Amino acid sequence: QISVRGLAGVENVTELKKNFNRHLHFTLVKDRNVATPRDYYFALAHTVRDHLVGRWIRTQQHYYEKDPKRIYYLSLEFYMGRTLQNTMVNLALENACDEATYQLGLDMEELEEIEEDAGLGNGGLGRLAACFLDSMATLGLAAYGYGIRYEFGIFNQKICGGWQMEEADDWLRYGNPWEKARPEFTLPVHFYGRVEHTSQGAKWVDTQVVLAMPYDTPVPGYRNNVVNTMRLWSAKAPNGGYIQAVLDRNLAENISRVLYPNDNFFEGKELRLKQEYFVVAATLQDIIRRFKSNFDAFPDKVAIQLNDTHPSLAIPELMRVLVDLERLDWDKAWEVTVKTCAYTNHTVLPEALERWPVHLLETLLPRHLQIIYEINQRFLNRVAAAFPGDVDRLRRMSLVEEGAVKRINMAHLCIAGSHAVNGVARIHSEILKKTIFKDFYELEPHKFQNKTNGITPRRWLVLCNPGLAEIIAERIGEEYISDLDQLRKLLSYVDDEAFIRDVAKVKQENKLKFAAYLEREYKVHINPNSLFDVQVKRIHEYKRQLLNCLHVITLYNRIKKEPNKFVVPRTVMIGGKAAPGYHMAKMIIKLITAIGDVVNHDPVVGDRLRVIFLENYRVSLAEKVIPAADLSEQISTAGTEASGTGNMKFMLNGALTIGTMDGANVEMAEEAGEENFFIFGMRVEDVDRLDQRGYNAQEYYDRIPELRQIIEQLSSGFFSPKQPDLFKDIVNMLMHHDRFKVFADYEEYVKCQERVSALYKNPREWTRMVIRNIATSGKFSSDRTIAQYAREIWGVEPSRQRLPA
Amino acid sequence: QISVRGLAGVENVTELKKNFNRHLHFTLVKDRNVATPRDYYFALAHTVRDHLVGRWIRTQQHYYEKDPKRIYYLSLEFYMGRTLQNTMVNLALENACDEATYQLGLDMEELEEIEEDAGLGNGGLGRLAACFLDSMATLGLAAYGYGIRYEFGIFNQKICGGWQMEEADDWLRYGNPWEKARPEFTLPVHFYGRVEHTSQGAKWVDTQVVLAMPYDTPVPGYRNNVVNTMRLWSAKAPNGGYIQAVLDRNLAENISRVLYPNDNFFEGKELRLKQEYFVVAATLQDIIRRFKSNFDAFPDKVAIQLNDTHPSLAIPELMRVLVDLERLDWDKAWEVTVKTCAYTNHTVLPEALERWPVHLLETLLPRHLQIIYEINQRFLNRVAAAFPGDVDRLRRMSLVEEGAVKRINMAHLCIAGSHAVNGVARIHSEILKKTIFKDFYELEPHKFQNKTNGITPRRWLVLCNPGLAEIIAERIGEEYISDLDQLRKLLSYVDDEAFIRDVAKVKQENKLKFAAYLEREYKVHINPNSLFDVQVKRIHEYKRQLLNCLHVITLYNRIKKEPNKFVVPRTVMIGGKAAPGYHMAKMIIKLITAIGDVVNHDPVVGDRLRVIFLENYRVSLAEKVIPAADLSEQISTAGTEASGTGNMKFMLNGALTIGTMDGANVEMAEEAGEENFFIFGMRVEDVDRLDQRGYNAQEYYDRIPELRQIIEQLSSGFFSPKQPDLFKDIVNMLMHHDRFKVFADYEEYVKCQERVSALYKNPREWTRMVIRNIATSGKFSSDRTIAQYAREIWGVEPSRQRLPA
Ligand SMILES: O=C(N[C@@H]1Cc2ccccc2NC1=O)c1cc2cc(Cl)sc2[nH]1
Ligand SMILES: O=C(N[C@@H]1Cc2ccccc2NC1=O)c1cc2cc(Cl)sc2[nH]1
Ligand SMILES: Cc1ncc(COP(=O)(O)O)c(C)c1O
Ligand SMILES: Cc1ncc(COP(=O)(O)O)c(C)c1O
Numbered sequence A, B: 001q002i003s004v005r006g007l008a009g010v011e012n013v014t015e016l017k018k019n020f021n022r023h024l025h026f027t028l029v030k031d032r033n034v035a036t037p038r039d040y041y042f043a044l045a046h047t048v049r050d051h052l053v054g055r056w057i058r059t060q061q062h063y064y065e066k067d068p069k070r071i072y073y074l075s076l077e078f079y080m081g082r083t084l085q086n087t088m089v090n091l092a093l094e095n096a097c098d099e100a101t102y103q104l105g106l107d108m109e110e111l112e113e114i115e116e117d118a119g120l121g122n123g124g125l126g127r128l129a130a131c132f133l134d135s136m137a138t139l140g141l142a143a144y145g146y147g148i149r150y151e152f153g154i155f156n157q158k159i160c161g162g163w164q165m166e167e168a169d170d171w172l173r174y175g176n177p178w179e180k181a182r183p184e185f186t187l188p189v190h191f192y193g194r195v196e197h198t199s200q201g202a203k204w205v206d207t208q209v210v211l212a213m214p215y216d217t218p219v220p221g222y223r224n225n226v227v228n229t230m231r232l233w234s235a236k237a238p239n240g241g242y243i244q245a246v247l248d249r250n251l252a253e254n255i256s257r258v259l260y261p262n263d264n265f266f267e268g269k270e271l272r273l274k275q276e277y278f279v280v281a282a283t284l285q286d287i288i289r290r291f292k293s294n295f296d297a298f299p300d301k302v303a304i305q306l307n308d309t310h311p312s313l314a315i316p317e318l319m320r321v322l323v324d325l326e327r328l329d330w331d332k333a334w335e336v337t338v339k340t341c342a343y344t345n346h347t348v349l350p351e352a353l354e355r356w357p358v359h360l361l362e363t364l365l366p367r368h369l370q371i372i373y374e375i376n377q378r379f380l381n382r383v384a385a386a387f388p389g390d391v392d393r394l395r396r397m398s399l400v401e402e403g404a405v406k407r408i409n410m411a412h413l414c415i416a417g418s419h420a421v422n423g424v425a426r427i428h429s430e431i432l433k434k435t436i437f438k439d440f441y442e443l444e445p446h447k448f449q450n451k452t453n454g455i456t457p458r459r460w461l462v463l464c465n466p467g468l469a470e471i472i473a474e475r476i477g478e479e480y481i482s483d484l485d486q487l488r489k490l491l492s493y494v495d496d497e498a499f500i501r502d503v504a505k506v507k508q509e510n511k512l513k514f515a516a517y518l519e520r521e522y523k524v525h526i527n528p529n530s531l532f533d534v535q536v537k538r539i540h541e542y543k544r545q546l547l548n549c550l551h552v553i554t555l556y557n558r559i560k561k562e563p564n565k566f567v568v569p570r571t572v573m574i575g576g577k578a579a580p581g582y583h584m585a586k587m588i589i590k591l592i593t594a595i596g597d598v599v600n601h602d603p604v605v606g607d608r609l610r611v612i613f614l615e616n617y618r619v620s621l622a623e624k625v626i627p628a629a630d631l632s633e634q635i636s637t638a639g640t641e642a643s644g645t646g647n648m649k650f651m652l653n654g655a656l657t658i659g660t661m662d663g664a665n666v667e668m669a670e671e672a673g674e675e676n677f678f679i680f681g682m683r684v685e686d687v688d689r690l691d692q693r694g695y696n697a698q699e700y701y702d703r704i705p706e707l708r709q710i711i712e713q714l715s716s717g718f719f720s721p722k723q724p725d726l727f728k729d730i731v732n733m734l735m736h737h738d739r740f741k742v743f744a745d746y747e748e749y750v751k752c753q754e755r756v757s758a759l760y761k762n763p764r765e766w767t768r769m770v771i772r773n774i775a776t777s778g779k780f781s782s783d784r785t786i787a788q789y790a791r792e793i794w795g796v797e798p799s800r801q802r803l804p805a
Helices: A012-024 A037-066 A084-090 A092-103 A108-112 A124-139 A242-248 A247-256 A270-292 A314-325 A332-340 A360-362 A366-386 A391-397 A410-416 A426-436 A438-443 A458-463 A466-476 A482-493 A495-520 A545-561 A584-597 A619-628 A647-651 A663-674 A684-693 A697-703 A703-716 A728-736 A740-760 A763-774 A783-796 B008-026 B037-066 B086-089 B094-105 B108-112 B123-138 B242-247 B249-256 B269-292 B314-325 B330-342 B359-362 B366-386 B391-397 B410-416 B428-437 B438-443 B460-462 B466-476 B484-491 B497-522 B544-562 B583-599 B620-630 B646-652 B665-672 B684-693 B696-704 B705-716 B727-734 B741-758 B765-772 B782-794
Strands: A068-074 A078-081 A116-121 A141-148 A158-159 A163-167 A187-197 A203-218 A229-234 A303-306 A340-342 A355-357 A407-409 A422-424 A448-449 A531-536 A570-575 A609-614 A632-633 A656-659 B070-074 B078-081 B118-122 B143-148 B156-160 B163-167 B187-197 B202-220 B227-236 B302-307 B341-346 B355-357 B407-409 B418-425 B448-451 B531-538 B571-577 B609-614 B631-634 B657-658
Touching: A012 A037, A012 A092, A012 A448, A012 B037, A037 A084, A037 A092, A037 A108, A037 A203, A037 A229, A037 B008, A037 B531, A068 A270, A068 A728, A078 A124, A078 A229, A078 B705, A078 B741, A084 A092, A084 A108, A084 A203, A084 A458, A084 A531, A084 B108, A092 A242, A116 B657, A124 A229, A124 A458, A124 A783, A158 A426, A158 A584, A163 A584, A163 B070, A187 A270, A187 A360, A187 A366, A203 A247, A203 A270, A203 A314, A203 A366, A229 A247, A229 A270, A229 A448, A229 B070, A242 B428, A247 B249, A247 B330, A247 B620, A270 A303, A270 A360, A270 A632, A303 A314, A303 A332, A303 A783, A314 A332, A314 A340, A314 A366, A314 A410, A332 A340, A332 A366, A340 A410, A340 A570, A355 A360, A360 A366, A360 A407, A366 A391, A366 A410, A366 B631, A391 A438, A391 A684, A407 A410, A407 A663, A422 A783, A426 A438, A426 A448, A426 A458, A426 A647, A426 A663, A438 A703, A458 A619, A458 A647, A466 A482, A466 A495, A466 A697, A466 B583, A482 A495, A482 B008, A495 A619, A495 A684, A495 A763, A495 B657, A531 A619, A531 B391, A545 A570, A545 A584, A545 A609, A545 A663, A545 A703, A545 A740, A570 A619, A584 A609, A584 A728, A619 A647, A619 A703, A632 A647, A632 A740, A632 B705, A647 A656, A647 A663, A647 A763, A656 A663, A656 A740, A656 A763, A656 B418, A684 B070, A697 A728, A697 B355, A703 A728, A703 A740, A703 B620, B008 B094, B037 B086, B037 B094, B037 B108, B037 B143, B037 B202, B037 B227, B070 B269, B078 B123, B078 B227, B086 B108, B086 B460, B094 B108, B123 B202, B123 B227, B123 B302, B123 B782, B143 B269, B163 B583, B187 B366, B202 B269, B202 B314, B227 B249, B227 B269, B242 B249, B249 B269, B249 B341, B269 B302, B269 B314, B269 B359, B269 B531, B302 B314, B302 B782, B314 B330, B314 B341, B314 B410, B314 B448, B330 B341, B330 B355, B330 B366, B341 B410, B355 B359, B359 B366, B359 B497, B359 B696, B366 B391, B366 B438, B407 B410, B418 B428, B418 B782, B428 B438, B428 B665, B460 B466, B460 B620, B460 B646, B466 B484, B484 B782, B497 B620, B497 B765, B531 B620, B531 B741, B544 B583, B544 B609, B544 B705, B571 B620, B583 B727, B646 B665, B646 B765, B657 B665, B657 B741, B657 B765, B696 B705, B696 B727, B705 B727, B705 B741, B741 B765
Parallel strands: A068 A141, A068 A303, A141 A229, A303 A340, A340 A422, A422 A448, A531 A570, A531 A632, A570 A609, A632 A656, B070 B143, B070 B302, B143 B227, B302 B341, B341 B418, B418 B448, B531 B571, B531 B631, B571 B609, B631 B657
Antiparallel strands: A078 A116, A158 A163, A187 A203, A203 A229, A355 A407, B078 B118, B156 B163, B187 B202, B202 B227, B355 B407
């Protein structure tokens, strides 16, 4: 069996079994005769959960007495996934549980498949939060994750008639064994009301209260005995007629009901604003109380990291508390606030920027608006002094945006109230300084940093790709698991026939296992001897699933033109959710399935090309498909993807990347060598030049016969005979309203895809290049990222020293 | 210590402690340093809960293989109270837990005070359901309780400015250690839709589904190793825009949200009808499936007991299922149904009768209405044949009621679709036959029975009055605990000086403990050397808390007239909830407090009379005040209280009763001797005679100067100087619209109260009479009642044989 999954200690197995059987009887109230695989999964989950407890108590108590600086990671999303396997891995219990369940006549992997994702995020930002909690525990940081316990996470996606359908993600249906309710640490949050300016200052009164009930989930570090805490707040009513009043409690409880499924788009829903304030206010009460267990030392004991502008109200909230309740002078309080807070920016796309209507803030959060105006005044006073007479800089830098409706720019608030501002990869971090926050960079250059994203090599290697983890371990030991730069040592195996063999063998095993999953779960058949070409990520125009579609159609039309000409077989897989209200994204999902309907049923094509849409892409599913992937599609328009992290997943798991010089793709290529990446298309510079003279898609259509053909297939109704004009909006958009310049990268992309195939025809040289990629993915460990946060922002030293027993 | 609470086994205590400490660590995730009394209560609850599990599995499996007839107790209410103490008592674990907690430095009674009531009932009917589940387990019956898991039970009553305020009863706030969720046994219930009459018969289609999620609570028998099941169903949504759709799931989930606080009043709310169908449909699916694990044998394997008309839809539901889904012929199905179902009637008051609008049933439950019309037709066909040409009997007996709005009489449906119909005490059961269901009794006399109510001597003696239980045990052993007629043996101790001493000593201890509770919990001071005179029960005109008020005012006015004349000191206590919309009941609560405001602050009165309103009367509080009570107020207007059961509580716990010849008061007096009860006022016969010539309260006012005085105190504003006419509605009602003839029993009552005092001045003879009452309360055991149900209705033999280990 696999040594990286640890020891199956004889007494450990015995004890595991005993405790499994104990929970089944006492916790589940079952005999082996009525018990289902779900009961078996939960008995395991409880048994495994018990091993966290001693460390969870010991860790938190150890922070109480060492009194290190506390890091508070505020996020509206934690995209956690399942936790059974992760717990076993970080606790060295995996092989032991596997044996114990084996002796009881159970298949542990089958049991793991019953666990529901905690899918309390939308995409990258949400998952980064999750990898970050993991890496902070593994680096021995006294770090707390602080969010919302959504009753419903990211919608369950079904595909019906080729179309996405949304169903509620009822993830707490059968209970959550991993969380611990702390109803005794419940806290009041206030909304609405108004401000009384009197004698000991301002007073926020006549508010409506919503209670915040914390639920704590354990966050285990990798084999270091550290167990940190994720605290997620749940909304509760405080204590028409009686019945209606009792039923109307739902209204306040709706605050924590459901994750907003808008990935990188701003919607301006009040219920969202309530969700943001809810998490901010409850969290800060916790931070202060725990601090108190004078505020000059506050930034020496407290860091607040803002995952985007979503918890940006933490800035006026802290000020409110310090000034109104603690009665600090404004200036004192503001020094404290800025040194406490730092802000992570995740995207440059204007429509994802949070700009809340002033009337809304005035109504829901009156005292916060006042405070925000006062912040603006003093901040623009600073601008004016540093740049005398520069009036336009003033209106550009202003927290307040003028227009038919006045709004507050929440990014501006964050920069003003934070000592550090970071982007999430080098290219993105620089553009913040150069253009989009150029003015702020000019006022305070020292605020601006880079922290290039990362993924945890626990989840994203050991967990999901134990076969790859094992052949690496066979060569270089297990230290790389929490020291991922050691993967560099694998470059020395690039001519090693055993390693070349094993790497290819591991990938083929992962492909077989994925095929089996699709057959099991969907009765979908995929050609195992095909290049698995995978684009998985949220469905957006900027991510250009449509470019991928153009290519797929290109391959189909080329096959039909020259049927007799050999092409490398491909299974092209696309997966990802569209926001329920983004019509275009939903049209693109349908187009993917509609291409499959033609392509996958053409006898002339047979098994040399398949196109399939992976339903319900989510963390658990990523862990299945990514280790199976040959080609990693990372084809955003240059300038549009701040970083990405799926890109990193694929690199770590033995896929080659086809991509643009966008986001962290650039650094990955730098790390591996551009010779070892399929880089294509416009650079940022070329996109800009095209914007200066204006993007005319018609030029590209008039000069490329293959593209012209595809577009006429779409228009004429070749991919929807029953509904000839089904795809007119997509055609119109591409021809006349394409913000992401799909046609401009078509040729370079198709050519680059030809090189991909060319290489794939040479298995040895494909695998050698893959080795060059794995060996060089170390930079993309989230431990690396978190240690830069710790040293460059939070001002804490990380550590991988074991806590005792 | 107390031997009736069992043995503190040395290894048992050791093990208890171990397991207490185990749960505190693994279940509560606490160290002894952060732990609160609430954590300590839950560690105990888990520790004690573990002792049910083996018996719960063993009991249910034993029913599977013995395959006895299953009893299904359908009730919209189970008024359970707390379960920690009850579990320890029935498991002989009380003294042991007390010692174990003692060795850990904890007071177990203090820990018990943290447990929230399961207050999922309103009053008598709800509590009878609870005593019944207990007695069925103790009699070894394969009995299932089937109801609704209300998110909110009976409202928490606060008193503010003398007025009742209602607050949500958030009883699941900190978790329910006692219940076990069975989400895997979730079931669909259908609403709305319409009927297709085709080929394999009718088809109910286009329904809206609400899921029913069962939660199972253990029901422990008294020391017989039996643990039966209470199954309570919780409403769940099945799987505007996305967000609103997810939020709109609340609407269906509102079905199980809150108990309707209408005690003995019919309101006609659709949400109520949904609650009734919900419980009926989910329950019957369970019954059928479990039966299947041909339907001629169905009544030999299934009894359905209907606790009032609330689950009366079980009758058309069973028919629906048998006919539409199982495709039995109508007649076959109807024979099955009638032999399965029996109906318990709880009140004769017309306004508590369920008569649902036909339009409502047509809309929510179309197929049920059809079936109900068909039932009516065939049933009235039977009437017509048995009573040819009797047309008015036809419209009187009809399930269908004519009027501006046509309704279905649910009582009529129950009698028609049930093989037995019972009242809840002898007098009530006879009046059903004589008058109110005279016509049905004449068609089918053999259907009509009596089952006089009872209370469990576990909860209502051993649990709540361990001191009384112990001195009884000292004389006659412990067999009486499940064989309550053995209390008769105590009549031989009526001249026993040790027993007389102990009985009085026990009561004084209970009074001290109650005083302490009021001082602790409310800083209310009561004179311990006073006669404790207690009227506790739901606030209603028929129960005549106002008569009690007249008396209290009488005593105050008599004191003030002759200050120097000795009177036996009294603390008069009134407690009970008013329905949020019953204005008059709410006015009566205020009047009680307002009398206290004058009386309790008159220096001339000092501590010789106090009037206090016991806030939040509920099962746990009954267990505190009833063992403390000297005088038990049971003063309903004759003819109006079908049985009562609080009356029985008081008799069992050493109070004397002042009462009318109403409900089970009559049988209690018969059991004890009328010499041993303070019986007063009109009998049913006198009430009737007064109705024939018309009740004129003015006569009573014009002939009784003391009454006249009190009424002028009310009118003139003596009990509300700030608001002189506060009590005008109460005055007007009593003078001109009194349905319950308060003035007609005033004189007899006041005189009878004089005899009460006369006796109380002779402690020995008071206690001897109390002995005569306790000794004769055996008939009022719910085991007795349940065994009559088992033998006379269900057709099963009860048993007190131990199940093994
Ligand atoms: O949910 C937990 N415990 C509760 C406590 C409770 C209180 C009242 C009623 C029932 C229960 N049952 C539990 O399992 C729980 C224990 C642990 C240990 C963890 Cl590590 S994460 C975690 N959650
Ligand atoms: O609530 C119980 N067990 C659950 C099972 C579960 C499933 C998923 C997630 C967490 C948990 N925790 C429990 O305590 C539970 C066990 C028992 C034993 C009883 Cl007797 S009454 C009773 N309730
Ligand atoms: C489920 C899920 N969604 C989104 C992402 C981010 O991927 P990308 O960088 O391709 O948008 C990841 C890594 C993932 O696990
Ligand atoms: C809390 C509670 N309410 C109501 C009742 C019934 O009492 P009564 O027969 O006096 O209405 C009881 C016994 C009780 O425990």
